[PDB]
Amino acid sequence: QNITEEFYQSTCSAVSKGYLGALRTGWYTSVITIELSNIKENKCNGTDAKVKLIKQELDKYKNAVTDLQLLMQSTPATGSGSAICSGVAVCKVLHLEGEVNKIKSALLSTNKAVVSLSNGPSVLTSKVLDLKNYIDKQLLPIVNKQSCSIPNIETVIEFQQKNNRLLEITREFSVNAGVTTPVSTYMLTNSELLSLINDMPITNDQKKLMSNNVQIVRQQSYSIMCIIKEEVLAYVVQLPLYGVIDTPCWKLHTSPLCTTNTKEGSNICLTRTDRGWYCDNAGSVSFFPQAETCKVQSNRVFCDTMNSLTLPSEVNLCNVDIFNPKYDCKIMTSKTDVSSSVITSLGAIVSCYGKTKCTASNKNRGIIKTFSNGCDYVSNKGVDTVSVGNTLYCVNKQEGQSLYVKGEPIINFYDPLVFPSNQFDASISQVNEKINQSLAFIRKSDE
Amino acid sequence: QNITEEFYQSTCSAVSKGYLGALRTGWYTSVITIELSNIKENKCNGTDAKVKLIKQELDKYKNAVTDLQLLMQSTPATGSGSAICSGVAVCKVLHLEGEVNKIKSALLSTNKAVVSLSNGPSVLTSKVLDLKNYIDKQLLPIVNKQSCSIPNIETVIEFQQKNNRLLEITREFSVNAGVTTPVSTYMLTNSELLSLINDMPITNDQKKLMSNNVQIVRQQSYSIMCIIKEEVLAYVVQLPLYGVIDTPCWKLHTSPLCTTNTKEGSNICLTRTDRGWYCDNAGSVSFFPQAETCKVQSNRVFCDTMNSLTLPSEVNLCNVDIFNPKYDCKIMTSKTDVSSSVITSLGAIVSCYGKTKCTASNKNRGIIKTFSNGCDYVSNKGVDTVSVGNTLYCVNKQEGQSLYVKGEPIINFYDPLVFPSNQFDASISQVNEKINQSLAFIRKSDE
Amino acid sequence: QNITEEFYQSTCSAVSKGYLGALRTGWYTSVITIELSNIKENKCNGTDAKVKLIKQELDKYKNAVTDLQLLMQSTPATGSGSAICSGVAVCKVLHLEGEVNKIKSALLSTNKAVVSLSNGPSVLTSKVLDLKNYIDKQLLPIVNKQSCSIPNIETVIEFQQKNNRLLEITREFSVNAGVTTPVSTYMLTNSELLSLINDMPITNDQKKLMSNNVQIVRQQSYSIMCIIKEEVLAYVVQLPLYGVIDTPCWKLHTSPLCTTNTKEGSNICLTRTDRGWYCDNAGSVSFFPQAETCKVQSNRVFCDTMNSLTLPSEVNLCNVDIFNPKYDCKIMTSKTDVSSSVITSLGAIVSCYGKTKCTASNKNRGIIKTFSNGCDYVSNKGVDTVSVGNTLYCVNKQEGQSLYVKGEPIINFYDPLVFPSNQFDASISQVNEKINQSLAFIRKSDE
Ligand SMILES: *[C@@H]1O[C@H](CO)[C@@H](O)[C@H](O)[C@H]1NC(C)=O
Ligand SMILES: *[C@@H]1O[C@H](CO)[C@@H](O)[C@H](O)[C@H]1NC(C)=O
Ligand SMILES: *[C@@H]1O[C@H](CO)[C@@H](O)[C@H](O)[C@H]1NC(C)=O
Numbered sequence A, B, C: 001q002n003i004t005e006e007f008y009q010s011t012c013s014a015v016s017k018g019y020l021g022a023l024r025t026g027w028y029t030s031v032i033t034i035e036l037s038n039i040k041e042n043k044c045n046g047t048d049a050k051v052k053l054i055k056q057e058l059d060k061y062k063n064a065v066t067d068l069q070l071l072m073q074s075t076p077a078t079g080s081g082s083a084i085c086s087g088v089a090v091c092k093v094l095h096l097e098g099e100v101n102k103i104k105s106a107l108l109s110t111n112k113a114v115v116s117l118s119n120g121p122s123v124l125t126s127k128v129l130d131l132k133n134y135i136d137k138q139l140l141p142i143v144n145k146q147s148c149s150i151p152n153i154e155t156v157i158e159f160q161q162k163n164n165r166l167l168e169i170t171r172e173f174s175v176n177a178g179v180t181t182p183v184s185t186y187m188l189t190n191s192e193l194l195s196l197i198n199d200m201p202i203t204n205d206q207k208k209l210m211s212n213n214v215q216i217v218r219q220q221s222y223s224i225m226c227i228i229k230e231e232v233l234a235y236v237v238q239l240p241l242y243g244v245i246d247t248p249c250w251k252l253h254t255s256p257l258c259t260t261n262t263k264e265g266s267n268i269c270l271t272r273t274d275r276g277w278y279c280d281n282a283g284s285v286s287f288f289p290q291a292e293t294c295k296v297q298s299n300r301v302f303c304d305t306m307n308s309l310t311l312p313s314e315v316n317l318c319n320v321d322i323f324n325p326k327y328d329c330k331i332m333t334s335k336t337d338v339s340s341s342v343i344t345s346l347g348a349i350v351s352c353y354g355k356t357k358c359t360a361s362n363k364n365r366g367i368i369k370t371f372s373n374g375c376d377y378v379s380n381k382g383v384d385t386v387s388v389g390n391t392l393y394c395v396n397k398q399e400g401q402s403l404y405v406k407g408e409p410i411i412n413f414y415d416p417l418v419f420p421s422n423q424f425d426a427s428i429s430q431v432n433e434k435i436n437q438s439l440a441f442i443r444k445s446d447e
Helices: A049-073 A085-094 A099-106 A131-143 A153-175 A190-198 A204-212 A214-219 A313-320 A428-443 B049-073 B085-094 B099-106 B131-143 B153-175 B190-198 B204-212 B214-219 B313-320 B428-443 C049-073 C085-094 C099-106 C131-143 C153-175 C190-198 C204-212 C214-219 C313-320 C428-443
Strands: A004-008 A013-024 A026-035 A113-116 A122-130 A222-228 A232-241 A244-254 A269-272 A276-281 A284-288 A294-297 A300-304 A309-311 A330-334 A340-343 A347-352 A358-362 A366-370 A374-379 A385-388 A391-394 A401-405 B004-008 B013-024 B026-035 B113-116 B122-130 B222-228 B232-241 B244-254 B269-272 B276-281 B284-288 B294-297 B300-304 B309-311 B330-334 B340-343 B347-352 B358-362 B366-370 B374-379 B385-388 B391-394 B401-405 C004-008 C013-024 C026-035 C113-116 C122-130 C222-228 C232-241 C244-254 C269-272 C276-281 C284-288 C294-297 C300-304 C309-311 C330-334 C340-343 C347-352 C358-362 C366-370 C374-379 C385-388 C391-394 C401-405
Touching (some): A004 A347, A013 A276, A013 A347, A026 A085, A026 A131, A049 A153, A049 B153, A049 B190, A085 A099, A085 A222, A085 A232, A099 A113, A099 A232, A122 A131, A122 A153, A122 A190, A153 A232, A153 B153, A153 B214, A153 C049, A153 C153, A190 A204, A190 A214, A190 C049, A204 A214, A214 C153, A244 A269, A276 A300, A330 A428, A340 A385, A340 A391, A347 A385, A374 A401, B004 B347, B013 B347, B026 B085, B026 B131, B049 B131, B049 B153, B049 B222, B049 C153, B085 B099, B085 B222, B085 B232, B099 B113, B099 B232, B122 B131, B122 B153, B122 B190, B153 B222, B153 C153, B190 B204, B190 B232, B204 B214, B214 B294, B244 B269, B276 B313, B284 B313, B330 B428, B347 B358, B347 B385, B374 B401, C013 C276, C026 C085, C049 C131, C049 C222, C085 C099, C085 C222, C085 C232, C122 C131, C122 C190, C153 C222, C153 C232, C190 C204, C190 C214, C190 C232, C204 C214, C204 C244, C214 C294, C244 C269, C276 C300, C284 C313, C330 C428, C340 C385, C340 C391, C347 C385, C374 C401
Parallel strands (some): A013 A300, B004 B401, B013 B300, B026 B122, C013 C300, C026 C122
Antiparallel strands (some): A013 A244, A113 A122, A222 A232, A244 A276, A276 A284, A284 A309, A294 A300, A340 A347, A347 A374, A358 A366, A358 A385, A385 A391, B004 B013, B013 B244, B113 B122, B269 B330, B276 B284, B294 B300, B347 B374, B358 B366, B385 B391, C004 C013, C113 C122, C222 C232, C244 C276, C276 C284, C284 C309, C340 C347, C358 C366, C358 C385, C385 C391
């Protein structure tokens, strides 16, 4: 893992390079079945406590079954509808007549089986729980008589253990309108997930990747409820396919860059916009503005292209030349010089203004650097914490090399009188045009 | 269900009509009691494992009881205080002396009972768990001797099952400062909720509505902890009363509308503001800006007026004439032409700019539409996915009719030199006044 | 508890005073160990149901152990890395050879013990669960033979109870990448937390404070996973140290202040910015802009300085003189006069504009106050609810004294023609300078 960082003194921004990205570009759906028992209440003369315990657990089984039924009778729309059409397409096929009977026959003797549906896909189905065999074989002879037979206490415990997975799956599907993410161990055990990864149409290097990051895989997966019909509970798990592997990725960090005059009210500020994760993707750059869309593990990043923006690759030139014409680099302006700090991958940017006490300390040496007014940076080599005012941040102690790219702060190139200080989604060149417009009103009204 | 949609080419916005709204306007509180056992530790000479299991579960019962006590001794304020005064008013009455004794007497023989409190309301109380009868009858003869009696293994399992609901209710009330939402199956089982709906002072059509959408009802309900006193645990469930039923509701979708010049830096943008859910409400329009405030089920919408804004009904004319003087329609401006798409109820708005590759595909036919630069729309009829750059969205496959309302994009009516490009919460007429002000500075400085 | 409030009619803002703050300034780490059993599968000829139940629970024990191992083999970075360096420093020491053996020896006979690590700290270690003794003593004689011995049903239940805490701790550490907050009862029981508070190097008054607010303490704590190695599961709990106790704190509430002309489009608005919690802190003021960073219990506030801004104490003069030169008080401007209300600690600010029906009611008297157009305030004395349009808010019924500070609304001091209506993070003096600039263009172009 070659993680490196670059602080640009001129724009008060840093870029953390060297990350290998795995971008989600496709979906792999799989059908998960639970064999249920079509057992209407069959209540008999019962008294001894083992029978009461069985009848109680049996009512919890019926309530979970009717709840999954009212969940499929009326399914509320979810904010995930734009990401689940593939798994939903499998559920719509399962609703066809005879289709639940097909998977019901293929999984008659085995747990796993490939099934060609009436919509063509050769989908892979599994069978993680068998309640029809247990209730109809171990319980009906106990409840299908004039008076109930006495089950042994081992059966009471075994039925509470088996029925448990059904109750938790019904709880998640009910509170989330049939669509859950991340995918829990109740929907798919770690053992079942690794077996599903092994059976995926991916390279052996991708199976090793998803198997070594199962929690991230779970967080980028969906579990979709299909149907309860004819003693079968089926639901689709939608797993990520990372069509982009090992693509270069980097993270942009930005902090306010103000002037440091001694008279308050005479200072102007500037901040680069669009901080977050950038990855090379198909001749363009995929930008992820939201913080939860990229999970990081050491050297590696796992992003979902669902919540990304597609930018031309020239967007990276804002990191090397912000005044560069191939790309209109974006900034925001204000006159709000409040001190702050940003913890980067290998150090910390500190924007210190006013009377704020900014410093960087080592746990055993004490304060090793005092920041003056302006925007500065310190590496994690020898630094443990950074204090800005009354706030103390912890520096990431990850190994890597930092580079301080010295340069004049670009905020000094601007005349304060004509500066646009109210700008939000503004470009470097847009700001220069507003300055030419305020300068033309004085050029004409001097001549 | 008559769901229809209208895309306005002129403003790059769409309106999804035909939804029937159910707006929350009132609250129905109900008291939920759990009979507890005032049993101080009564530890005796115990050794056999059944006694250990009982004593362990009994300590978990005392810790849950003392935790509910420290929860009512000091109750942290919650961000829900502006929505729970009705249920809280019932809890303040329960704290009166003799009032817990009243409900304790009315529920002596039955589970449900109406109780007239010392604040007048005829409230409906229930009794979902009876631990006083079970501990004092089944457990004290086992622990109230010199040496403990041996309980059978059926009692150990039955006590872990009954004590379980207490522990989960105490967990939710403890982590949430006594106020939980949504209302879980631990606070109120699906069986108890449907019975509470049946006993509500609502029409039979509203009971069928809440009973068919119990999860949405749960998400729009509160469970408030009252008091633990004199062998009684009481808490109030605050359920929604939908005074507005079947009111017309619609959803506004907006997307950036920019000019498409070939020289970057010469383009101006405009976006309609206030996207979200609108419902007719009491001679006005209730607007819901936040995304989680309206749950949708097929044709129907369930909103809470707690987080809504009240607008004049003329706000709908921004959908028919945005240049119309009865209402100052709102826009935001910029020069940020980044491509994007919005998945609507029956199609997709696509704002394509620059070199971005925007398209709409069918699963079996491939690309069926390529968007050019500007703002456009495509219906879900025959369309499965929409790609903008490296991002792929899924189109909602819901049945309904779309209408493409052709019209000149209003961004073309604006001169770029005098356009206000930094506007956030700006009106159509506000922007026109800023244009008259920049045009007067050139009219006077030409004459 | 002396809670008081002050409404400033001139700026449409209120300040709730009298709160005693407890600001987190340090961390107290403690090591929590669980003795595990290094037991490879030792599967034997087993058939009777008690053996099946044991073997099932034993596989759930191994899966939880391997999951904690893959969690420590690859630990994903978390957004909490800037707040956990202290507890992480203890985990890095535990990874040293012989260091897990040290705590393994000190806790050989007792549950609690102070341990001097190979990094100096005298840390306090505990031992909350002993699975090595239970599996190796109660289970291996049952599974380490040619054919498995029959365990009694008491052992099956006791092992499911003991193994349970391991499975829930592994679930939380797995889904959260080894760092959880708040700290659950699974990580640390209420009994263990109070005992940890008693053993803390704090005054007796701080132990009473944290013990009376354990849920807030839990919400401001972290549980960090260390290592699984040599039959020991260790994880660090990072508890808050409140170096600031009983410091004066107050909460600023702001609401839009517009003009009330009868011709729409001629009104200008202004809103004070930086609403939230303020606390005196080390010669400065700690401001908390985010809503979840301060938990309130009656009179008291518990904040974390991690997400605060440090402001000069002159920031309070925006509450007494907003036109005052020692501090540049901040405002935002617009022309968006939409009615709204803010529920304060002791009353409600109501900003009423247009045709909106704003009122304040008592539950038994009905409407007791009708607001006219402008910004106004009403105390909670005699008031239960406040209605703005179709929205009804509940007034906090907390006891305290309100003071209505009468004054001319400052929005009336501004000429509408030259007002800057697009301002976001703007100062009072910044706005005055933009007004001098628009007035100079007319002074020179009249002369
Ligand atoms: C003003 O416009 C000219 C175009 O001739 C350009 O070269 C110059 O950079 C502009 N001024 C500023 C301050 O950007
Ligand atoms: C300028 O003001 C006049 C008022 O006489 C108005 O009719 C016109 O629409 C305004 N101009 C623009 C571009 O809105
Ligand atoms: C204009 O500038 C002068 C400085 O001489 C200042 O005193 C005055 O307050 C400014 N005007 C406004 C409206 O703030």
